[PDB]
Every structure is written in C-alpha cells, then in structure tokens.
C-alpha cells in the first residue's frame, strides 16, 4: 500500500526566520565568480576592532582642549554604548541592534599638540561602585588607573575592563536604574608646559574579546 502520515496540529506556519529553503523556479544559472575581490568582510566585529573612530566631546568636537583653571579634571564621559559621547561611533552603531554584550573596550589617546609643549596626564576608570566619581586627581589613584607622559610617544592606549554582576550586560540602558549606570572615565592633567590650546584626540574601538549576542530590530519603522 502507501505510507500513512499524521498531519500535526500547530506546525506548518510561516515564520520570518525559519531555516527551511524554498522550491526553485529557474534552474541552470551560472554566475561569474566574484573571486579575489579586495575588501571582503565577513564579521562586523572584525571591522569594529580593526579601525577606531573618534569620540564626540562637548560642543561637537573630537578633541579635548587643555584648561587653564583650578579644576584639574579635563573631563569625564560615561562608558556605555548608549552614552552621549559615544554617539558618533561605529561601535555604538553596531551595538544598537543587539540586546546583550560582554568584553573589553579599548581607548586610544593621541597627542596632536606641539612638540615644544610637554605635559603629564593620567586616566582613571571607575566601575559602578561609590556614589560619586573621584573628582579629586588623587582620589582616583585608588581606582584602576594609568599614567602616561608625552615624552616617549604621542600615542597611548588604555583598556577598559569588564566589571559587572552577571555574565552579559545590557546594551540598551534602561529608563529605570538611575545613578551612574556602570562606568565613567575621567582624565586628569598632572602638569602642562605652555599647553593652553594644545589638543588631545580620543578614539574608541572594540577589544580583543568583545562580543554581541542577540540580534533585534529596535528602531521605529
């Protein structure tokens, strides 16, 4: 005879992301090869890691200018892919389409200041701990911090560690959960010599072990 089958209830519908293929309608088509085409990228995070992009400081500029006032705090900016300073970044552009992330984030400092001006600076990262960031340039030494002087190089790279409770952290910082979300970076000027309009440009790229997890389509369409 013939095989008996049972038509299950609930299966068979169309789902936007089902893994089954369709039935061809026009066979025997051979397309010219696209071999040895320069500039082929297969992973978005590879492109994000390879090429850093600038940060957007206040007033809409990608450098921080030396300040001639008692506040040794050059500036602070939130470390979050949804922050105001990371708004014009490729990493944030990728991250807006995913729900969770985990890994390291790198920071690049480059001195476009004049050669005849020498100075000393430090950078300090503060995880979501104490209620107030250490605005004091000395209080931030107790954090995980680094020191660099523009006398051996004009480039200095600082890695931002991943510190949180769970394994994966949100990328889409919630309306609730006020107070410093997770992390801030503030940069101090230990000393400066004839640096009144000397510049300092900061750029951010993905770390070696960065990772994004859950693809969503969040925008308003």
């Amino acid at each position, epitope marked *: 005879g013939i095989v008996p089958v049972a038509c299950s209830d609930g299966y068979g519908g169309l789902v936007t992301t089902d893994p089954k293929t369709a039935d061809p309608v026009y066979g025997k088509v051979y397309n010219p090869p696209r071999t040895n085409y320069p500039g082929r990228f297969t992973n978005l995070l590879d492109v994000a890691e390879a090429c850093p992009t600038f940060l957007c400081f206040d007033d809409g500029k990608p450098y921080v200018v030396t300040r001639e006032d008692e506040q040794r705090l050059l500036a602070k900016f939130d470390v979050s892919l949804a922050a105001k300073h990371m708004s014009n970044t490729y990493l944030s552009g990728i991250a807006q389409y995913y729900a969770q992330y985990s890994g390291t984030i790198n920071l690049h400092f480059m001195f476009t200041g004049s050669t005849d001006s020498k100075a000393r600076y430090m950078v300090a990262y503060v995880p979501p701990g104490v209620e107030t960031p250490p605005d004091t340039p000395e209080r931030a030494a107790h954090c*995980i911090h680094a020191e660099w002087d523009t*006398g051996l190089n004009s480039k200095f*790279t600082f890695s931002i560690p991943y510190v949180s409770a769970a394994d994966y952290a949100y990328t889409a910082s919630d309306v609730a959960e006020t107070t410093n979300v997770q992390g801030w970076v503030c940069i101090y000027q230990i000393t400066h010599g004839k640096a009144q309009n000397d510049t300092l440009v900061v750029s951010v790229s993905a770390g070696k072990d960065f990772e994004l997890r859950l693809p969503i389509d969040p925008r308003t369409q």
Partner: nanobody
Amino acid sequence: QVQLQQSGGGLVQAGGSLRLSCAASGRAFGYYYMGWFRQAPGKEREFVAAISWYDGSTSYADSVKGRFTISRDNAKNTVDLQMNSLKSEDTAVYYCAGDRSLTVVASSWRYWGQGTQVTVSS
C-alpha cells in the same frame, strides 16, 4: 598574582650581544605595558626601554637609542630585550616591570621582577 621572572643575564664582552627574557604569568599580560629598568651600582632605577601591547610601538632611552631592541610574544607570555653594541656603562641589574602606565618614573609601576645581573667586561 602577576609574577615576572627574569632570565638571560651573565657576563659578556663589550661590543657583544645579549638577550634577556621576562616570563610573565597572569590574566592581565595582554593589557599591561611592559618595559625594562636598569639599576646601576649606587644609582636609582632608570627607564631603558618599553613596548606597547596593542600596535607594538617602541620607545628607548636616549642613552640606548639605536642600540637596543625590545620585543614581546603574546602567545608565549614572554618579553625580551635584545641587546647589541655593548658598552661598559651598561653593567647593572635589569628589572622587568609592567603596568597600564607608560612613564619614565619607576615608582609608578606596581609590579616588578626579581632582576637579573648583567656585567659588561671591557
């Protein structure tokens, strides 16, 4: 615990070459700037070299510029100081150190090695 182990020191003639090795153990080898410091007898520790951890870079002191070579191996967690064109002023103990900081000061580097003795014979 970030631990640094130095090796490769010894006695060597002036004008020769010697290579020092810094074996490092820990989860933070890939985020730390690593450089070398030399402590002459009766003198304080002084920066002699440093290598970055992202692009690779290089930076040598003026007294050793054009004569030294510092290299890192991330896969083996080893940092080496390739030394050439020896002079008698280089007789000192060489200390491997690292931190997120890149400076010429020595007090700013949290982690230090036990040091190795390098003697230059004229």
